Amino acid sequence: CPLMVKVLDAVRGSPAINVAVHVFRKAADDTWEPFASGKTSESGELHGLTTEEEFVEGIYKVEIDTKSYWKALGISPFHEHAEVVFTANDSGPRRYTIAALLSPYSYSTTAVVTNP
Amino acid sequence: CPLMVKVLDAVRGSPAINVAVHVFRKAADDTWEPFASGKTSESGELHGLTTEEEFVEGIYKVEIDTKSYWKALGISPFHEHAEVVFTANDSGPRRYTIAALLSPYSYSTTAVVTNPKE
Amino acid sequence: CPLMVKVLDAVRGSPAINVAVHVFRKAADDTWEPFASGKTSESGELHGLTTEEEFVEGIYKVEIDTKSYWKALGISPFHEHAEVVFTANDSGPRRYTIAALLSPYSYSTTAVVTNP
Amino acid sequence: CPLMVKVLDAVRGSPAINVAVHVFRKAADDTWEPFASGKTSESGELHGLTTEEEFVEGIYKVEIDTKSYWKALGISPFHEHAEVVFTANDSGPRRYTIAALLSPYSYSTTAVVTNPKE
């Protein structure tokens, strides 16, 4: 749909599968409120988290439980989890892909905003 | 110091100067408590946030305002900020070096933990 | 096919399209010899560069002309180009995806080796 | 010095110690000429490769043997090495800091160029 997540493992060089992803929308009260969640698939992807009709402009936060994932491989991670806060103001493009590359002591995240 | 931050700019090939950094500590009520703040210097570093005595066990959050940095450069970035959450000094004290590499639609962070020997 | 390349732009947050990619195979003489080439598509991907029958074990080098790409956006790049040398010993998995994330002064590359 | 390398380990949260680095310069015949070599120290840094006089205009290649590093750690990595190709001091001399962040199936590199004022 209009919001996709992709997670990869930099240690094994494979998609990070079955990771818990939680999405939040900043509400007026300025707190974070549940929006959507899921666990990444076998190809380290999470789709159809939302629809265009309910994905309105605003501030969203995507939180990835990197800790649980690393513990499970029996590796001691640094981060409690990874977060990505961005303003989604679909004024042009439509699709957003939040990609994160994980390592026990580091993680990189990039956003690919396209139109088709 | 126990806590050090290093920020680099991937578009210019330079350290990230005047980037504001806010550090919080997860309060006793699962509330985030301001713990320290600063701005990266000419070398994109920030030392002097805290001391050994002040820096006790707990979950800390280092928030880097990447947004203000880019905006003041003519580029509108994707992210609002960059935040690193971690548990510190649970096995006696350590030295943490939180490093970030910035790009308008991406950023990378890694941590360097060294044992003072305590 | 069994070798895929993906390129992304970290400055515009979009796929890096129409980038020249050249692949080499280290020959006995130990020099690099032409193997395959292409320009990334509209989604910053390059597929069907080879086939299983001709992708044999050995040392391959994937070179991405990051310079030409950055010059075209009128940005001064640091690197002359990005390279990725790896040993492909399909003894297990089959597919290799060489992903590279570009920035005028930096580039990260990760490999996703899967089986389906 | 004009040329400095910094290597970090993303799996351990530490500098990359004893990593071999070879530097080449594109010879007059489009041949790579060995220019300097070293090994990262306890702080995952390598200084003293060259001098201002020695380091003239040209295209250089910094090759980091990431493979030997990982192997000597029990992990078999994806890449054979990590190489950074760039043109240096074409607009009078500069100072270059080639930094790499290593992972078994990934690695990141960025450069920090500063003007000595020449």
Ligand SMILES: N[C@@H](Cc1cc(I)c(Oc2cc(I)c(O)c(I)c2)c(I)c1)C(=O)O
């Ligand atoms: N006192 C040091 C400060 C410094 C610490 C680190 I640790 C570092 O290394 C990286 C490597 C990568 I890859 C990054 O993305 C990032 I951010 C930092 C660099 I350069 C500089 C000095 O100024 O000499």
Ligand SMILES: N[C@@H](Cc1cc(I)c(Oc2cc(I)c(O)c(I)c2)c(I)c1)C(=O)O
């Ligand atoms: N089904 C989606 C899945 C997908 C998105 C991305 I974006 C991607 O590319 C990278 C490149 C680097 I470098 C990373 O560190 C990471 I994480 C992902 C890859 I492979 C796959 C699609 O193909 O559109």
